[PDB]
Amino acid sequence: ERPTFYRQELNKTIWEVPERYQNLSPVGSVCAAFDTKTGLRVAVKKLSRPFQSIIHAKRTYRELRLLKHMKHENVIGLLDVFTPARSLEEFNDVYLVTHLMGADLNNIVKCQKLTDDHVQFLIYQILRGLKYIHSADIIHRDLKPSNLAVNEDCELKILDFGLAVATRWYRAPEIMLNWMHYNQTVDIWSVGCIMAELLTGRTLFPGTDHIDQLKLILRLVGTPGAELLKKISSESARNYIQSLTQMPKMNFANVFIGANPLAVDLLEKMLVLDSDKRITAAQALAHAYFAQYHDPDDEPVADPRDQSFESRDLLIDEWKSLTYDEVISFVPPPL
Ligand SMILES: CCCCCCCCO[C@@H]1O[C@H](CO)[C@@H](O)[C@H](O)[C@H]1O
Ligand SMILES: CCCCCCCCO[C@@H]1O[C@H](CO)[C@@H](O)[C@H](O)[C@H]1O
Numbered sequence: 001e002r003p004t005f006y007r008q009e010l011n012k013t014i015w016e017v018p019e020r021y022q023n024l025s026p027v028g029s030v031c032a033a034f035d036t037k038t039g040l041r042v043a044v045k046k047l048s049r050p051f052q053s054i055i056h057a058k059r060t061y062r063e064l065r066l067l068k069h070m071k072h073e074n075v076i077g078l079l080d081v082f083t084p085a086r087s088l089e090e091f092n093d094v095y096l097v098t099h100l101m102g103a104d105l106n107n108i109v110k111c112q113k114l115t116d117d118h119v120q121f122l123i124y125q126i127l128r129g130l131k132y133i134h135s136a137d138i139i140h141r142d143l144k145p146s147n148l149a150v151n152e153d154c155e156l157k158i159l160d161f162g163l164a165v166a167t168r169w170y171r172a173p174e175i176m177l178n179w180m181h182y183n184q185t186v187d188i189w190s191v192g193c194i195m196a197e198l199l200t201g202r203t204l205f206p207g208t209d210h211i212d213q214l215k216l217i218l219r220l221v222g223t224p225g226a227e228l229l230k231k232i233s234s235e236s237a238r239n240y241i242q243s244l245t246q247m248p249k250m251n252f253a254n255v256f257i258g259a260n261p262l263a264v265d266l267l268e269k270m271l272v273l274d275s276d277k278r279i280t281a282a283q284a285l286a287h288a289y290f291a292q293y294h295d296p297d298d299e300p301v302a303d304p305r306d307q308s309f310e311s312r313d314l315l316i317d318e319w320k321s322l323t324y325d326e327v328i329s330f331v332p333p334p335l
Pocket of ligand 1: 113
């Protein structure tokens with residue numbers, strides 16, 4: 001079963017991969033390549049210093065376990081995870097493979113004009129992915145147009161977590177403020193931002209820094225009431241924003257002109273300041289805007305994940321060894 005490998009140097013390091021992967025070419029760290037096995041293009045990444053230390057080794061372990069768990073049409077999946085190591089002593093390097101998708105929301109929104117119909121389809125698919133991820137007790141904290149890949153048949157996948165500045169544009173405000181603990185609806189904020197952009201062709205909130213970012217948000221959704229108070233995040237953050245000048249809530253129908261009234265009704269549930277009042281992925285899926293696609297029996301949740309490890313105090317070589325095993329025991333997606 002063991003594949004045949006080959007070495008090569010690639011920008012200050014040796015890559016040692018199976019020969020089904022041809023024409024490795026870097027974007028770092030990461031390489032794009034072509035899989036002669038599946039006839040498709042792929043992305044390959046080699047972790048750096050997986051086992052730097054107790055801290056890293058265990059994070060490596062947790063991240064790998066998380067990634068092999070991801071099994072959903074709208075979410076990225078492992079094609080392959082391999083080591084050139086033939087045994088534990090020489091075990092230091094881990095390599096990951098997924099499909100290299102073709103296009104992303106960023107580049108398609110730059111040059112095709114979407115209709116209300118395209119948008120429903122697209123956003124449906126993100127929501128479908130989000131719900132799965134969320135169900136897995138995971139918060140993407142970084143959804144954005146370039147995190148969202150699509151292929152020729154218009155299938156969309158979310159990509160950008162547990163792995164790898166050009167945008168605070170999609171960040172929930174509470175993340176601007178350093179809330180230190182987050183609701184999953186942070187992502188929902190990003191989703192409304194992305195939808196607005198797909199509808200209008202342009203960025204909803206193109207701030208040039210953290211503070212300017214808040215100001216733009218406040219110009220659309222309105223200054224909040226004394227729920228400023230329940231931000232003992234930072235007295236000086238609190239005061240700072242209390243100092244801002246006050247803005248009325250804009251009516252979304254008068255901002256998103258020509259849009260499907262169902263679509264405007266959705267944004268208004270997603271672009272809400274209080275994370276406690278944002279609609280969740282699950283509810284968004286049922287919104288009448290998606291009537292054409294909604295199918296409650298076809299919008300699956302993630303299965304239970306065993307996370308015993310997270311508490312155990314292990315030395316580095318124990319952590320390294322639990323990693324070796326997950327490598328060994330990776331079983332590939334069919335076809
Ligand atoms: C469903 C997701 C895939 C993206 C589709 C690419 C954009 C197609 O093209 C769009 O089609 C509309 C009519 O259907 C036209 O009115 C628009 O002007 C045009 O930009
Ligand atoms: C820009 C000025 C207003 C700040 C945004 C309001 C805070 C968002 O919502 C807050 O998020 C927290 C979790 O993230 C929750 O624990 C809080 O209960 C909730 O109020």
